[PDB]
Symmetry: C3
Subunit: 299 residues, 3 copies
Amino acid sequence: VIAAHKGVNQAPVPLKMERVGPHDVHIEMTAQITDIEIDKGKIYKAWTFNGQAPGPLVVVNEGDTIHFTLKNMDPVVPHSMNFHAVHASPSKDFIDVMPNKSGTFTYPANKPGVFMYHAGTKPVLQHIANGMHGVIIVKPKNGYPTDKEVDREYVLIQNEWYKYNDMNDFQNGVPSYVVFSSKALKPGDPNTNGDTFTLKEKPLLAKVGEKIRLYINNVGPNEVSSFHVVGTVFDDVYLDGNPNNHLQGMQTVMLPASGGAVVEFTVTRPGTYPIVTHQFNHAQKGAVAMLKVTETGED
Amino acid sequence: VIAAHKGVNQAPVPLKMERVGPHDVHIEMTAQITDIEIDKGKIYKAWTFNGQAPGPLVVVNEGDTIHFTLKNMDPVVPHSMNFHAVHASPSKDFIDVMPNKSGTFTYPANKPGVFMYHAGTKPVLQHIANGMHGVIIVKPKNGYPTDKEVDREYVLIQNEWYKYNDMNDFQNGVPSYVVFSSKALKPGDPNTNGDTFTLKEKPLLAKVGEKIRLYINNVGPNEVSSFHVVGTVFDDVYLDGNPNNHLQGMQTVMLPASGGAVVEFTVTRPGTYPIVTHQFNHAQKGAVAMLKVTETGED
Amino acid sequence: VIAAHKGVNQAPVPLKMERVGPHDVHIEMTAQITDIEIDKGKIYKAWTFNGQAPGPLVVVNEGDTIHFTLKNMDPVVPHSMNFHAVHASPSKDFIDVMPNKSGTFTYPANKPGVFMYHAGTKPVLQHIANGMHGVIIVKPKNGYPTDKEVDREYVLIQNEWYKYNDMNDFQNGVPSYVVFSSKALKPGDPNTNGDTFTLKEKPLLAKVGEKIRLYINNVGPNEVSSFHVVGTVFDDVYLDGNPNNHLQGMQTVMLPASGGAVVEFTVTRPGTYPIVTHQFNHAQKGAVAMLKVTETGED
Ligand SMILES: O=N[O-]
Ligand SMILES: O=N[O-]
Ligand SMILES: O=N[O-]
Ligand SMILES: O=N[O-]
Ligand SMILES: O=N[O-]
Ligand SMILES: O=N[O-]
Ligand SMILES: [Cu+2]
Ligand SMILES: [Cu+2]
Ligand SMILES: [Cu+2]
Ligand SMILES: [Cu+2]
Ligand SMILES: [Cu+2]
Ligand SMILES: [Cu+2]
Ligand SMILES: [Cu+2]
Ligand SMILES: [Cu+2]
Ligand SMILES: [Cu+2]
Ligand SMILES: [Cu+2]
Ligand SMILES: [Cu+2]
Ligand SMILES: [Cu+2]
Ligand SMILES: [Cu+2]
Ligand SMILES: [Cu+2]
Ligand SMILES: [Cu+2]
């Protein structure tokens, strides 16, 4: 634990977003050091955006230019932001912001989909593994062909956790935990961090007969994901959330590290449905969420 | 070795299946403890369906409802069944059957493809790793567009084996063996277990010039598979065996854990053709099968 | 270090190719033992084709029959060649050539794409891991639908390096290095070996606004690749380089071991753009290349 991080636990700060034109959006995040309970009794003093790991959800429209400000609250470590959604010059636009400073960077989100974002400061592995990852969704101008069939939707993110700030482990060791989190799209949706237990104890909710859409991304840092919902089959899958990349009837979706998808499936009966990576060593180490399906859709 | 499993070696029992209506099929399996030779001189006292690991092949038609009975012969461990093919309530329909009891569960197979099945009892990793995995094929109502080109077909399954019933190894260790097995579709086809040697010593057979279809699934538990046939290219691939997910001219097919495919390729010359996962550490640890191609198609 | 390899460092020999008919091409390679600097201060006495690892690039046209000669310069180890592009009998056409001998083998390249080649001598893992891997590109007769949009193109290959000639490490250990190399398509293109530094210090070059095509293959031996270019999104992707396998708007391309692709992306701003596998443990261990984009396209 970096001497200047000892005892530091910066309270989470809300994401700030506001539209400033028909095709322009302001976003303001922080980089901050925040204690997160990743397993019961296990605190990780994470490197975060806004005190969440993964960070807060960003949603924009295809064709929006993002005017992004990062306020670095870390007392000693520089941080930066890399959005996979955007076309940008990495050496000009994804550059470091020093402690106690801010930086603003502008770039377009030209492509629909479910994109990873993460800090881009060398060593990138260190910043991602310590918690500086997240998702930005870019909504397609023309929608998805199955939009009218979807009854309910959520966002799920997979990540790993390693021994604390240990570059040897990050490079060469198996993950200690692999976890899901959910980030809110609409008021009332849960908003959680990557931990082994919250989405088991407080399942996502749905109603019998519904078609559910999940926007998913496996942020890694290191593992691929074999994404599967127990008790159903994916009716439709759009790789990276691009409407053109359309598969049907998949049992399990292969996600690379940073890989995204939009997946849709029908829940036909009441009960609790596990959501896993089917790499079962990772599932055993935390990567199981639950979907509770009731006759009403409320608990 | 669980005290009540010491010395236990339950003889394999045939799968029971019978059609009971134009869209309804009965299946009866066992859960049982059976010694399997996974490498020469290496016995694994596997947790199995029907004394095979992977378990027996199930084939049904798209739109069939399955009335599935599990007879648990294990003297002490509960077991259950999860079919990836079906729409079901996991907490009602994939529940545990206690030792010396049976349970019956009914659910539809609405989607064509090559699906994993496995025990769903917590910890799922333990039940899969110990051998409780298999494949169910759901035949598409409308076939595949290349059906008329296929001359011969087989089923191949990839799995791993770890240190015996060792949850630490299952979670954190590399596999000791990675293996292929073949499960019979028609009388005379081989029916083998996941071992390092049988499909090398007794290759699958084909005839010069034939187009071969393989129904494949990588059941894991933990690894992905880079499926490749030496000396050919896949003419056509259907991801998860759904006819819509149609690729052409692939050298190697990426399978997630639990991932399936229908793959088709032409063998143009006499000889022996290795079949591998191209993750060559896994191939070296057992995952090489052989296809012997002769002028007649018989040995 | 095999006693007969001690002190051996065979100078690289150029690939020999010549067209001998409208649909027939001669290729002559060597198998040879050559010291390669894989990281600064770290020499690997590689098993190679032609003194390069990965080996030299081969480019042919769809429908060409290849008349391939391997001249084995290794004083003691037999070697062979397996081209993923071709239809061949592995047990007749991919056979070993003994030390100080040559062998010639003929087979057709019927399928367009970006194919791995490698030695096929048992244990195959040993020959691949020690450096005997490479790429053959088969150009599609009808092109790719986006050909007219591409301004500049390069070839990139990903491989791993392990502890020297250590079969235990090859089977059971994490890679010590994961690396990119580039192989020349046109005069003036760089031609490099798999190392941790050359494509950082001497980036690939491009011009602002260009659409870039990369022909890529992950030769392994053991890992999958999460291929990503920072600061852009792939406009179009053709899996295995087959024009039919067409995805759009992908952030990251999942490559199995031996998996290939043609990927295309636009660079909109001047700067330096990292090229990674997004499995960041591998990126940290060497697998980052750089693309320098200038107003002119020259350094
Ligand atoms: O039903 N999924 O194992
Ligand atoms: O089907 N999830 O084990
Ligand atoms: O020819 N497959 O290495
Ligand atoms: O092409 N199998 O090494
Ligand atoms: O912008 N790629 O992290
Ligand atoms: O987006 N490369 O970290
Ligand atoms: Cu407008
Ligand atoms: Cu602004
Ligand atoms: Cu950071
Ligand atoms: Cu990234
Ligand atoms: Cu509905
Ligand atoms: Cu009917
Ligand atoms: Cu019945
Ligand atoms: Cu079991
Ligand atoms: Cu499952
Ligand atoms: Cu035929
Ligand atoms: Cu001609
Ligand atoms: Cu010739
Ligand atoms: Cu060799
Ligand atoms: Cu190969
Ligand atoms: Cu252009």
